[PDB]
């Protein structure tokens, strides 16, 4: 079966809706499956918030070391790093690292608040040429992932294009691009998602997201040992609010689309 037939069969077995966009930077070719359909980003949206702060830091050499006070009232549903710093401070760089590498939701919220609200994250995406991304809410409500709800959504293709621009392309000046890549490569939350579908020795940077409706997402930049990078978005969502998340589906999709590379 072709790659498209394999992805359709994966979706058919999955009990949900699968969205895939792979960009092969060797030749700019693409593998697309529901890639123009909206999906709730869940915590994959954190890449855009962190990158928006990195953009600001290009013109403010003190920004990344700016102190942010962490209070008990800032804690939400999932904040393994920020809870260690209640009554102290974290820098904006430390908040970017925590948001991306541990998916700390308090850290995401501090990034959003620093920027001036969810709409400012949307404006940053637009400044990169991404007409599709929208951030509407803070964490954790941005992960409700209700079917057909446009809030906090993008498409697989839009996010793959923007992730390519952010990590390998024109979106950020070099020091800031490099910092984003360092953060993504050090992610701790993605072992069982895209990474599990790839050769163990390939270098990967990624950001996961999991929400209601069993919504299970991962966005990655992948560096093969002997080939140009691949940028891969795998989004997955299910019809029932309390569906289990399915990182195995993302690993399976990654294996299908990276075969031969
Ligand atoms: C982002 O996707 C974010 N997700 C959530 O905060 C929600 N659940 O996350 C945890 C890890 C708690 C889970 O048990 O799935 C969630 C479900 S419903 C809702 N309104 N929020 C997490 C923290 N990011 S991820 O990268 O770890 O998935």
Numbering used by the authors: 27 to 57, 59 to 238, 240 to 252, 254 to 290
Q: Would you copy out the relevant sentences from the publication that reported this structure?
A:
Toho-1 β-lactamase, also classified as CTX-M-44, is a class A ESBL. Like most other class A β-lactamases, it comprises two highly conserved domains (α/β and α), with the active site located at the interface of these two domains. After substrate binding, Ser 70 attacks the carbonyl carbon of the β-lactam ring to form an acyl-enzyme intermediate, which is then deacylated to liberate the inactivated antibiotic. Glu 166 plays a vital role in the deacylation step (stages 3 to 5), where it acts as the activating base of a hydrolytic water molecule.
To characterize β-lactam hydrolysis in a class A β-lactamase, we determined both neutron and high-resolution 15 K X-ray acyl-intermediate structures of the Toho-1 Glu 166 Ala/Arg 274 Asn/Arg 276 Asn mutant in complex with the monobactam antibiotic aztreonam, which is often used to treat bacterial lung infections in patients with cystic fibrosis. The aztreonam acyl intermediate was trapped for combined neutron and X-ray structure determination by mutating Glu 166 to Ala. In the 15 K X-ray structure, the average atomic displacement parameter (ADP) or B factor for protein main chain atoms is 7.68 Å2, with an average of 12.92 Å2 for protein side chain atoms. However, at around 5 Å2, the values for the main-chain and side-chain ADPs of atoms in the three active site key residues, Lys 73, Ser 130, and Lys 234, are considerably lower than the average. Thus, we observed clear omit electron density for almost all of the deuterium atoms within the active site. The omit electron density for the side chain of Lys 234 confirms that it is in the ND3+ cationic form and reveals the positions of all three deuterium atoms. It forms hydrogen bonds with Oγ of Ser 130 (2.84 Å), the main-chain carbonyl oxygen of Thr 235 (2.83 Å), and a nearby water molecule (2.73 Å). The omit electron density around the β-lactam ring nitrogen of aztreonam clearly indicates that it is protonated, with the deuterium orientated toward Oγ of Ser 130, with which it forms a hydrogen bond (2.84 Å). The omit electron density for Dγ of Ser 130 indicates that it is orientated toward Nζ of Lys 73, with which it forms a hydrogen bond (2.72 Å). The main chain carbonyl of Ser 237 hydrogen bonds to an amide group of the monobactam (2.77 Å), while one of the dual conformations of the side chain of Ser 237 interacts with a carboxylate group on the monobactam (2.70 Å).
